[PDB]
Amino acid sequence: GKSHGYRSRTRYMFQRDFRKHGAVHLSTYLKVYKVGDIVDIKANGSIQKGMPHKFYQGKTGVVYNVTKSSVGVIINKMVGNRYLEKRLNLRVEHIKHSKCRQEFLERVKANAAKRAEAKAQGVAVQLKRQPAQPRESRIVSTEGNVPQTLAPVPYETFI
């Protein structure tokens, strides 16, 4: 019959990265997590104790707890037509601080700046992100550049 064990289907998923087997490098352990920290989850196969379940691979959650060798991450898993809350107890080896928010966080610091930079000046700001605008008129020269004319090419083989 069918088989559906805890780690079933996870062949290549918990595998180890080419030429990156061996010990986990010591920075993975020097990093420091606090509550409220956003972390990305990716299981490290060499580390069996405290692995996330396969479902939570490539998932991102928030630290809600900090213990001796672990962080508790809460994930929103959705089942049926709704999300429930899942606290995951993960070991520090299956977790990294997430860059999902640094662009924001960078942007805020930046926005606060050119806002005071503008305030202390004479207001005049405009600092929402706008999306890619269509490009403007422009003139293209021929100094050094006459259009080369191409045609389509007959059928050939080389074989």
Binding site: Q130, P131, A132, Q133, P134, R135, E136, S137, R138, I139, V140, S141, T142, E143
Partner: protein
């Protein structure tokens, strides 16, 4: 008009700014539309055939 001429004059090419505004007309009826387009159709308020709205053109539209 005079930009295009002034450029030809100068041996060059005046490429107009790409358009900032388009005008969309729903052309297809109401049924057998797959979800993602069908959601978007709504988002652009085109939920019945031959109706139509203006759309400001950015990457994100």
């Amino acid at each position: 008009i005079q930009a295009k001429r002034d450029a030809k004059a100068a041996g060059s090419y005046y490429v107009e700014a790409q358009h900032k505004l388009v005008f969309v007309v729903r052309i297809k009826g109401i049924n057998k539309i797959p979800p993602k387009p069908r959601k978007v159709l709504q988002l652009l308020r085109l939920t019945r055939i031959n109706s139509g709205t203006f759309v400001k053109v950015t990457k994100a539209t």
